[model samples]
Target: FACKTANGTAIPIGGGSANVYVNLAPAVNVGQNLVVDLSTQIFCHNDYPETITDYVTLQRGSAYGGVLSSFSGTVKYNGSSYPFPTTSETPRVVYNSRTDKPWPVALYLTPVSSAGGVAIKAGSLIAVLILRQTNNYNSDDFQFVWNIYANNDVVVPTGGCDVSARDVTVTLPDYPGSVPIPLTVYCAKSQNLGYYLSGTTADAGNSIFTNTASFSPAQGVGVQLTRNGTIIPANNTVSLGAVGTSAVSLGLTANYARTGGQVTAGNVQSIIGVTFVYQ
Candidate 1:
């Protein structure tokens, strides 16, 4: 489902800052240009009002006189910055309570190329941080704390079911063809899977999918797919399990059905479409 909310009960309030350390040579020269590149990333949920309040505070411990007088940090990012693979990525700068969310920032010191040399700072830039890559995935290495509104986990699972083997070939042995061949689908672990077959022609009552005519298909033969002793109706969804149920394997038997005369030799093909309905 595209809808989501916060977890447990309410959002547990928390806050922190990201610290960076810059090392310097012994007694470095004065005017040397330096570039400090740091990345800040956050998990922005789909259609949710997530607010991230934070700042990058510079902490210069007791060093041999601050090597840098002052440098400029420019924040640069657009809609296309997120390379994370997703379908419903409508990244818009929304206003209101979610206006000032902390996104991935590429903070760097804009060097003065004209007349400058880069040196070092001192001590060890300390924060309460042990460099945590905010759990699960995404990226502050990432792992930005976002105050998600409403009810469940904000890690918006598209609830998508992906098959490992796209083109599955169920080769049936020849002879007096009354054999029932098995067609098992191996998919990645996905939540709450429900699927239905959609194709050129389907017999809803008989639970049969006829071979597409465009392909040079063998006449008088069709494919009957079934699950758990129940014939899955064509173009209709069949729920796999109860709520929150996750599965990785789908078992279906494809028994060749004789529509008319004897089934002759040729391509016995049915371009059946498998659509997984996940939540």
Candidate 2:
């Protein structure tokens, strides 16, 4: 082909931009070569005329990959894939030596026919350019700048945990022990969750979630929360890995701790306001 992006065959100049929504794995550590999952379908326009030197190039807007985190892109066509910010541009794919503004060419795709000069039909699945994380990012909102697709934004789930409000009553023991209060969370999919605690006072050193009990509560006593045998602090995250329609019981035990004084008996009540946050 003479011009790479030009229409060699008169088939209505087929392909356009693809709107891909990437739902990243819950905990993608910041570093080089971290990619989110792309399940969006990338379809081209018309059927291929010949199996000649055809290429689908992917590019980004001016200074793309945002400010918070710099990233590199990778495009996958058929089976093979290559990362962008190139070592060198592919030969017949990127016909022009122009990698300037308006098109900071990330990478190119060589359809599903053969290899370079590969071919594929239109209206079929084309290539998927996944935005790879390159460095430590403060904000992780990735975008693809190209021309066919439905929604053009890299969307993360703004969904919250469907936890309802309820009062959990636990009777205290005369000695220094704990009561196991297991919470069951059965959500639609696997989720990473955190609990924010309100009405808390530092056991003055003991990390006891000090009870702001309005009633005649017990003396020098507060509650300590633990998850999976580890002390769970305020705003701590617990991963409920793949708790699909089945129930996953989060065993959060509340222990009555002594804040270094006389342990008097009356009633131990801590109205801890728990808020659920989904990561």
Candidate 3:
């Protein structure tokens, strides 16, 4: 079935800082290939007089057992003072406008359509992060990083972490149309892989998958799930990819909801569910 957790929390710039909270969904397993998608949202307000100019990043975190090798997307922001794309993005970078400048009196995040366009499933979590100035600005001036509510949710297959893709068996519930969901398989173990030609070589014996779809993390990787190619809403038991072994599996979970939201069966409604079995 489908499921979701409560609303997460995050604070904008009080002293040029961003606070965050997130709920990870369950896992989805199907065939040898795992598909997963992570969805999330964030909330915050601009309480600053000076227009803050900063860069909000969305890079991958450190791998569970090794270096962070997963691919990530560009930083998503509410509103920007600078141009479309600039090289002056620093987690500790912030800008401050002078009295002669117009104080950006508004702060809000753009509605997120998808998690950096990565696929999803159930149980995965939407991770939200914010970056601002650290009270230190060089010739680049100081622009305090403003804040607003933001969140992230992810769907994955069992054994599939960081990397996206899952191999699983789905026991779909009674649904009519063809609903697609992404899943991830976090097979913690290493695949006995060799080397590559143009790409990075696989250490010793590792999976052939790369960190992302193009690179496709080590083989035997997993992914999250979603509906209609997005995590907007859907029903239970949507068809998904899965891992073969019974040892491989997936599931879903989340927190409560925020204001103006309805709660059912514990957490929020419309979250995806994951299942694993022997074919």
lDDT of each: 0.37, 0.40, 0.26
Give, for candidate 2, the lowest lDDT window spanning 10 residues. Answer: 110-119
Higher-TM-score candidate of 1 and 2: 2
TM-score of 2: 0.39
Off by over 4 Å in 3: 1-13, 16-19, 23-40, 48-69, 76-87, 90-128, 133-279
Off by over 4 Å in 2: 1-160, 163-165, 204-206
Query: Model 2, range 175-279, lDDT digits (tens) per residue?
Result: 578787745644444556545556665654435777566777678778877776687666554555554445566677888777768877767777665555555
- Give TM-scores for every candidate, taking all chains together and pairing residue i with residue i: 0.37, 0.39, 0.24
Between candidates 2 and 3, name the one with more favorable lDDT: 2
Tens digits of per-residue lDDT for model 3, 31-75: 111221222332222223254433223223211110111322223
Residue-level lDDT for 277 in candidate 2: 52
As a TM-score, model 3 comes out at 0.24
| Poorest lDDT segment (10 consecutive residues) of candidate 1 | 148-157
User: Of the candidates shown, which would achieve the greatest TM-score relative to the real structure?
Assistant: 2
